[PDB]
Design a binder for this molecule. Structure first.
Ligand SMILES: [Zn+2]
Ligand SMILES: [Zn+2]
Length: 75
């Protein structure tokens, strides 16, 4: 039913209170995300760093975790 996507990932600051995702880690820099930080979430239910994922996607338009084709690309 409802659908809508411009062509970019949702930007939000991690929350040490509400663990949106049971497990939150960055496969790019094998480092966890901190609160009040610009993070991103792949369309495959994966958390990443607005900076890391930005460097990865550039090289490979896919998920470095589940090699799940993300889809759209900023550049
Ligand atoms: Zn990272
Ligand atoms: Zn993934």
């Amino acid at each position: 039913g409802s659908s809508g996507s411009s062509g970019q990932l949702p930007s939000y600051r991690f929350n040490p209170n509400n663990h949106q995702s049971e497990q939150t880690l960055c496969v790019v820099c094998m480092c966890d995300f901190e609160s009040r930080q610009l993070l991103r979430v792949l369309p495959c239910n994966h958390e990443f760093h607005a900076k890391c994922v930005d460097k990865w996607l550039k090289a490979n338009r896919t998920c470095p975790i589940c090699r799940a084709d993300s889809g759209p690309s900023s550049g």
